[PDB]
Amino acid sequence: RPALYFCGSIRGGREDRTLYERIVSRLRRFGTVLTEHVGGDRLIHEQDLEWLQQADVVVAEVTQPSLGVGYELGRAVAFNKRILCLFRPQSGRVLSAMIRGAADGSRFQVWDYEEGEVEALLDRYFE
Amino acid sequence: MRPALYFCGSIRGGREDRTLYERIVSRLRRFGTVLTEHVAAAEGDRLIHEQDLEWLQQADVVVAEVTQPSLGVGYELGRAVAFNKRILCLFRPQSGRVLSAMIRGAADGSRFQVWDYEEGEVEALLDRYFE
Numbered sequence: 698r699p700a701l702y703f704c705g706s707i708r709g710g711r712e713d714r715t716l717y718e719r720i721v722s723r724l725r726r727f728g729t730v731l732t733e734h735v736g737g738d739r740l741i742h743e744q745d746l747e748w749l750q751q752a753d754v755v756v757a758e759v760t761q762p763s764l765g766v767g768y769e770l771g772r773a774v775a776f777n778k779r780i781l782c783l784f785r786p787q788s789g790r791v792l793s794a795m796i797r798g799a800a801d802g803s804r805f806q807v808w809d810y811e812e813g814e815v816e817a818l819l820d821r822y823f824e
Numbered sequence: 825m826r827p828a829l830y831f832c833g834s835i836r837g838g839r840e841d842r843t844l845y846e847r848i849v850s851r852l853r854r855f856g857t858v859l860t861e862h863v864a865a866a867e868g869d870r871l872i873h874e875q876d877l878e879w880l881q882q883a884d885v886v887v888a889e890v891t892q893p894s895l896g897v898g899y900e901l902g903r904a905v906a907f908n909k910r911i912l913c914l915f916r917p918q919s920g921r922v923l924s925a926m927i928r929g930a931a932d933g934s935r936f937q938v939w940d941y942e943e944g945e946v947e948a949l950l951d952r953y954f955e
């Protein structure tokens with residue numbers, strides 16, 4: 698059972714907070730989830746990085762633009778983590794080229810999806 | 825040999841601050857070679873990622889305007905930290921936003937600096953850091 702780290706916008710905005718709760722709930726079926734979503738900012742940075750380094754898979758919902766989500770993904774790539782990013786084209790946004798373009802299709806995957814189907818998608822990824 | 829400076833700022837996260845980014849890039853060009861995806865208005869995704877990452881890896885200093893939330897800007901900063909780069913981040917409290925804890929909290933006051941500023945003062949701030 699993998700250790701899972703979940704990334705999603707907070708100070709970038711909480712528009713997708715309910716969807717993040719669904720994602721985290723489904724991820725908890727497959728492994729232990731660490732996430733901020735359940736001094737000062739230095740402590741948050743250190744704690745989030747600690748949990749990210751411990752994870753077997755980093756899962757990020759990348760629809761809402763966020764510096765912190767991007768930063769976590771950049772650190773995760775440099776740590777050579779297995780990464781799953783989830784993006785909703787129905788938002789009308791174009792996903793950052795730095796995230797879409799970082800994908801290699803194996804270790805770093807980016808999946809476009811419709812909101813209602815996120816649980817099934819996670820089921821498929823996590824077998 | 826001119827110092828190599830990489831400039832980060834939101835694009836697909838939103839172009840609200842694009843005119844300000846042109847001012848920053850123009851000032852940075854006084855101090856060294858500027859590498860950036862940003863193009864002055866008067867002038868696939870894997871290709872963009874690889875090109876921007878190569879420029880970042882080749883830079884001495886990474887300068888980011890971090891007021892507009894952006895996945896790409898954050899990703900570049902994360903890669904830059906792991907690449908052992910010197911980093912300067914610029915944030916405007918007049919936006920009313922609370923800057924991401926991952927950026928504010930990554931600061932160490934020397935090789936990763938985060939400065940709050942007012943828009944009309946950005947050239948003077950850059951002159952201070954680079955002189």
Ligand SMILES: O=P(O)(O)OC[C@H]1C[NH2+]C[C@@H]1O
Nearest residue numbers: 704705707708709763765924
């Ligand atoms: O506050 P931000 O939106 O910039 O970043 C939030 C992400 C970074 N750390 C926790 C969460 O995944």
Ligand SMILES: O=P(O)(O)OC[C@H]1C[NH2+]C[C@@H]1O
Nearest residue numbers: 793832833835836837894896
């Ligand atoms: O499109 P985004 O906002 O996600 O990211 C833009 C930054 C990432 N690469 C160029 C620029 O600095």
